[PDB]
């Protein structure tokens, strides 16, 4: 969808006396559950997609304010970019004392009408000016029949909800919890896009993740040309990036204001001010000095116009894993520049896959960049698990190292092992099996940095101190393999360390 558009999620909780103090047992509370869900998802969205929009608005309350001054509707925080000033507002309600505050500030929960509630949320989406990529409404209620008493209200409810379904807005409820009354065919089968007393769909909204994302975007579009005449349009995209911590901003100590760094360069002999034209680049070789233009120090790189230079093809066994150089990239046609080039792209991909052969190219990502040698190794698509995209179809960009990279190894001799040790190592390596999944692990540094960020933001008692799968679970290795370390010691270990 349109990239500049942004995701927008509005939160809407049943504020009636129904679930404010349901608390059948003393281990949970639906309001203490819905607010917990909202806080968790909203803090996750802080780090994840800080560019997006969230809003929380309660219905059925006794105090009133909204855009249209209606009855029993409270817009707690409007639609805006997420921030701590609202983390605190939500946190103010977490607690039995907090629920006391909520009830004596907005109300026990009066009469309501989800027709008017959807009215309000629709107005909220309409209000804000930034374009919206996706628009989702989350209800939080368990009164599976909003009203079996006034049918006209319910008819008006289907009407307005169907309208919202056709104004571009989706709607969603998770059935939180109710003694009985845990069904969706009662008035909601026609609303949302078998059933039980609790929603799995709300459990994952507690998964409490700190990833971040960037949407479907080119790194750079370059025109792959087979020769000097045939040219096709390729979008160089990125599929692994090594996220770094967000770059810090310098604050004046005490105002906490931005400080607007103003680095400059000027003379030492005089109190003048050197201008960018007024400086020269230099090196020192052979006990003699060198001068070039600041312009020339970048002209020393002009090698080829931007694009891709296919020369020939290679067998996929000759392209070796042993010589990785840079994060790989992905190749996919972009129909916009050269119309119909997608056909030729597909032809090359299919036929190369058929003959199990690589494609070699010269890659000049932008101007003023020396070219490297890159392999267009085709990739087949796989969808088998649930018919959802896993490996996008197209070409890799396996960068091929230049000679100046080999880093000649300090040769040492080899000593073969005896087949007895390798035979027992067979069992050793078998025992420590574990299936590896691409998203198995997290950066302890990035995760902990984000965690400390919330910790300092929200004035907590003590940071989360997340423990992460990066550290090995030592007892597991000592146990599930046994004491075979001593076996390999008595096999191949003299007394010295």
């Amino acid at each position: 969808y349109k990239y500049s558009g942004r995701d927008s999620l509005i939160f809407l909780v049943d504020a009636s006396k129904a679930m404010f103090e349901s608390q059948s047992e003393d281990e949970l509370t639906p309001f203490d559950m819905s607010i917990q869900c909202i806080q968790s998802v909203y803090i996750s969205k802080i780090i994840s997609s800080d560019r997006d929009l969230l809003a929380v608005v309660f219905y059925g309350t006794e105090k009133d304010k909204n855009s249209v001054n209606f009855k029993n509707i409270y817009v707690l925080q409007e639609l805006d970019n997420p921030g701590a000033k609202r983390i605190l507002e939500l946190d103010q309600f977490k607690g039995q004392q907090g629920q006391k505050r909520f009830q004596d500030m907005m109300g026990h929960g009066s009469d309501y009408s989800l027709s008017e509630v959807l009215w309000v949320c629709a107005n909220l989406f309409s209000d804000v000016q930034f374009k919206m990529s996706h628009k989702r409404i989350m209800l939080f209620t368990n009164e599976d029949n909003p009203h079996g008493n006034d049918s006209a209200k319910a008819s008006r409810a289907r009407t307005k909800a169907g309208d919202l379904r056709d104004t571009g807005i989706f709607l969603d409820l998770m059935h939180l919890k109710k003694p009985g009354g845990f069904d969706i065919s009662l008035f909601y089968r026609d609303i949302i896009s078998v059933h039980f007393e609790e929603s799995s769909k709300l459990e994952d909204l507690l998964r409490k993740v700190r990833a971040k994302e960037t949407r479907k975007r080119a790194l750079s579009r370059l025109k792959l040309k087979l020769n000097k005449d045939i040219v096709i349009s390729v979008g160089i995209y990125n599929l692994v990036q090594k996220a770094l911590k967000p770059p810090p901003i310098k604050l004046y100590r005490e105002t906490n204001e931005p400080v607007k760094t103003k680095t400059r360069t000027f003379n030492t002999s005089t109190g003048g001010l050197l201008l960018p034209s007024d400086t020269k680049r230099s090196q020192i070789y052979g006990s003699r000095q060198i001068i070039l233009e600041k312009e020339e120090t970048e002209e020393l790189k002009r090698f080829d116009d931007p694009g891709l230079m296919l020369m020939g093809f290679k067998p996929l066994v000759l392209l070796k894993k042993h010589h990785y150089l840079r994060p790989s990239l992905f190749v996919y046609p972009e129909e916009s520049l050269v119309i119909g080039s997608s056909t030729l792209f597909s032809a090359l991909l299919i036929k190369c896959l058929e003959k199990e052969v690589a494609a070699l190219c010269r890659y000049t990502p932008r101007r003023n960049i020396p070219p490297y040698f890159v392999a267009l190794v085709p990739q087949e698509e796989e969808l088998d698990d649930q018919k959802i995209q896993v490996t996008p179809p197209g070409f890799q960009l396996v960068f091929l190292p230049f000679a100046d990279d080999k880093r000649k190894m300090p040769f040492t001799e080899k000593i073969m092992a005896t087949p007895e040790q390798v035979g027992k190592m067979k069992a050793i390596v078998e025992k420590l099996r574990f299936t590896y999944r691409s998203d198995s692990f997290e950066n302890p540094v990035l995760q902990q940095h984000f965690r400390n960020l919330e910790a300092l933001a929200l004035d907590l008692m003590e940071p989360e101190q997340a423990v992460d799968l990066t550290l090995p679970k030592v007892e597991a290795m000592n146990k599930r393999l046994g004491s075979l370390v001593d076996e390999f010691k008595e096999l191949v270990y003299p007394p010295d360390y």
Binding site: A455, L456, D459, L460, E462, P463
Partner: protein, 70 residues
Amino acid sequence: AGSENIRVKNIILSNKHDVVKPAWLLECFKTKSFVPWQPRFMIHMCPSTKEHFAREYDCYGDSYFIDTDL
């Protein structure tokens, strides 16, 4: 500090600062006058306060710093 945070701890961990409980300034404000700080009013301090302990230059501790009261 009306209440702690880990930054309190940080500046607690960074003793280069002297970290003060809120009521005493209210006290000073209710005195209309700066009441000189007595560690009943603090949580923690750089040692220079502690050399002050006598109200002057001779200790480091407490079980000591009390004025006729109940």
